[PDB]
Amino acid sequence: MQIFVKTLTGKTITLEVEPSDTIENVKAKIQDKEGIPPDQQRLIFAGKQLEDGRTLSDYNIQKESTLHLVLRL
Amino acid sequence: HPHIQLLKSNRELLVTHIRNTQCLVDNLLKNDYFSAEDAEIVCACPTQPDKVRKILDLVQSKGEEVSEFFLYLLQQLADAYVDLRPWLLEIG
């Protein structure tokens, strides 16, 4: 399935994931596409920040969902 | 306004059964019925049904001509590959 991620430089990238994919996996695909260290990424789904442990299924992130990416140093 | 009303009545049916908003936004973008901002506004919606709701809101606002096209878009997208359905689901 596909999820969307708004990197707040305005644009919105489109990813290809599975409900089983962990948050790290999503960060990995983001790193591939945008060149950002996973330990600098924080994924936001509807106001809540996702933990690096759980999966997309555990968050009820279904097809054509949109997450927000913020930086952390 | 038989088309705006047609989208106002069966609004729940559409939100329920539409499973790809991307190929809808794209086609609307390519026909100048949707601004680049309208696309980003729809993409901003957290869940998929929310995106379906947002698209329907924008369509029913821009007029009747835009609505009539949206009906035609859904028709020729569902009918396009429908007879491949038995074989496709047969595999994976």
Author numbering:
A (entry chain C): 1 to 73
B (entry chain A): 17 to 108
Paper lines:
NOD1 is an innate immune receptor that recognizes γ-D-glutamyl-meso-diaminopimelic acid (iE-DAP), a dipeptide present in peptidoglycan of bacteria, and activates inflammation and autophagy in response to bacterial infection. NOD1 is composed of three domains: an N-terminal Caspase Recruitment Domain (CARD), a central nucleotide-binding oligomerization domain and a C-terminal ligand-binding domain.
The asymmetric unit of the crystal structure contains one NOD1 CARD and one Ub, while symmetry-related molecules reveal that both NOD1 CARD and Ub form homodimers. As observed in two previous crystal structures, NOD1 CARD formed a homodimer that involved swapping of the sixth helix of each subunit. In our structure, NOD1 binds a different surface encompassing about 500 Å2 that is centered on Phe4.
